[PDB]
Design a protein around this ligand. Structure first.
Ligand SMILES: [Zn+2]
Length: 303
């Protein structure tokens, strides 16, 4: 059961998918599992929908693990999923959130890369799409979105870790989210979880022009990182993608903000580079916990 599940260790693709089935079984009135597409290599892409009803309620999107090696994110997603089911009807603010909003949680946004990080290459980041006329595989899925696509901040070299693919939304993992979000039509927040560097970022990555909503999103980020910090003292920086970590094109929150999803943020979780992507399992739960406060803080500014 999800009560027996070990949240303080890293899991396989199958173990996470299994976790999802266990959670849906234990909480049929709160969580359901949607398949929004398949991965390049044919794995199902699963989004957990947390909802107390209504129809097409204003929604919060959270993608984790779009970069497969950032294992702290998938691990955080699993923890989040469990916590949603624990806190509804217990926590005032979260109960409040779930009463008015749906949450869509994609724990493994890049299943093919995730399996590859377990079977072949722990540090694999990209999808696993086959590039015609190349010896290399995979696209940086967070450079595949239709926001400044192909512009500086991503690579046209197929062997590059930042290769953006042949055209925006070329990756099924990405098109799947796009089609889902577009069809849903009522997303108010869109959260992309990554590691590492301890950043909370708002758009844009692809351009120096400030977003109209900068003052608000900046305050929200400031609030979020402060809430996150209160737990363990973890220090995050926040700002636009391009002023905080330089130009990046084809990014997810740049796309979503441009769809009118105002509350678009990207988290870069622990740490700052000591362990990097190989963050120790013993940090999974504390990271999850502090990140939760930050996320919850953002959801509150959305309701
Ligand atoms: Zn990443």
């Amino acid at each position: 059961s999800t009560n027996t599940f070990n949240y303080a260790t890293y899991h396989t693709l199958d173990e996470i998918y299994d976790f999802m089935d266990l959670l849906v079984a234990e909480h049929p009135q709160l969580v359901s599992k949607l398949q929004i597409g398949r991965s390049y290599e044919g794995r199902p892409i699963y989004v957990l929908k947390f909802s107390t009803g209504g129809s097409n309620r204003p929604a919060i999107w959270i993608d984790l693990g779009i970069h497969s090696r950032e294992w702290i994110t998938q691990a955080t997603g699993v923890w989040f999923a469990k916590k949603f089911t624990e806190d509804y009807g217990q926590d005032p603010s979260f109960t409040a959130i779930l009463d008015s909003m749906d949450i869509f949680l994609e724990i493994v946004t890049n299943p093919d890369g995730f399996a590859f990080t377990h079977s072949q290459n722990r540090l694999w980041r990209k999808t696993r799409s086959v590039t015609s006329s190349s010896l290399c595989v995979g696209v940086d899925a967070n450079r595949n979105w239709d926001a400044g696509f192909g512009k500086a901040g991503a690579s046209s070299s197929p062997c590059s870790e930042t290769y953006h693919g042949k055209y925006a939304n070329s990756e099924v993992e990405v098109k799947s989210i796009v089609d889902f979000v577009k069809d849903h039509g009522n997303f108010k927040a869109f959260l992309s979880i990554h590691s590492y560097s301890q950043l909370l970022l708002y758009p844009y990555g692809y351009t120096t022009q400030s977003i109209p909503d900068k003052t608000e999103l900046n305050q929200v980020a400031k609030s979020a990182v402060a809430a996150l910090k209160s737990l363990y003292g973890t220090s995050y920086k926040y700002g636009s993608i391009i002023t905080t970590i330089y130009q990046a094109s084809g990014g997810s929150i740049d796309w979503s903000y441009n769809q009118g999803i105002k509350y678009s943020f990207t988290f870069e979780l622990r740490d700052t580079g000591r362990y990097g992507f190989l963050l120790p399992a013993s940090q999974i739960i504390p990271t999850a916990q502090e990140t939760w406060l930050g996320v919850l803080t953002i959801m509150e500014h959305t309701v």
